[PDB]
Amino acid sequence: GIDHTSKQHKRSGHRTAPKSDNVYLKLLVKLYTFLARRTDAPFNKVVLKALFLSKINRPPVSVSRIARALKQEGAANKTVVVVGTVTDDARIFEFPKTTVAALRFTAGARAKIVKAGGECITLDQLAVRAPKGQNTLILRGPRNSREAVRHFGMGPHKGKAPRILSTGRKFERARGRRRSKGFKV
Template identity: 55%
Template sequence: MVQQEKEDDHLYKHLGADQHLPGTLAPPTSNRGGAILGVDIRHKDRKVGRKEPKSQDIYLRLLVKLYRFLARRANSTFNQVVLKRLFMSRTNRPPLSLSRMIRKMKLPGRENKTAVVVGTITDDVRVQEVPKLKVCALRVSSRGRSRILKAGGKILTFDQLALDPPKGCGTVLLSGPRKGREVYRHFGKAPGTPHSHTKPYVRSKGQKFECARGLRASRGYKN
């Protein structure tokens, strides 16, 4: 069968797209602008990790080019981790609040080190005093930027960081809470089952809307 298909492909090249020999397979067609139909890949052997970012942002792609070189040539795990995080989707690069960053940088042994965040740093109005910080991030919100600079801190971009310590010496890699999104509260055991703390999808809160559903027989059912 495979040999027959190879011979048919060879004949299509000589005959053109419009004509084919009788008794041979017709060229593959599709309703979507002449695109060839899907290929049955060996899904068990396929690696699904990203090799490049989905984003077409030219500045992000230049950073990928830079850190791909550093990950290959500089003997440092730091550059490999940064490169991997540059590939990630936005849901896997959650924003890091100013308060969490201050708390992490106050840990012993992290004085005078640079906080590196492959993502966004946002302001936190609950923080009254901001210490002097040296920060590197893809983006810093306007209010967070002004508060860091007002405290005498410094904000670097990733190309500036690559010039200062190419191997990532004197840095602390931080990231935001990846499971901090509200959608994660709905994941887990079914709402109402014993020992479940999963948040149900309800239209509204009130006396008429799934009050103690699954906990009492009078409210739908009891587990």
């Protein structure tokens, strides 16, 4: 037989196609999967892997996080691609013009960007303008801010958050959380 130096038939960890049944979503793939083939343009490969992600890994990108990136030196006229949803923010005021191509815009977010004289584009109108993806800025949402991960790797002295239903002083504040009662963590 063989001596196997690694596990056999082991399939790559990666999503090869969106686990969603959304018809229109699978269309988008059909487009970009063809572009990833017939252009070099590392950009297109990035988008294709992006379409596949689960909703947890396509966290919302604020409007203000777009505004921030357009203030990076020399970036003014770049068009910013977000695969995922763009959302509104009430916190910024004076908003630049530009263009933003995304999977989804919430209503407020769309009204925010057009009222500034800008433009809202889908992923395909993005491919017609930029087949290679010329002059485009790809952004990602802050995926470690998600609530659930406050609990990850929970363990002594890890500074992580106990999974718990309701918080008051009678809940897990006593023995092992302070030196007066037993020890501290």
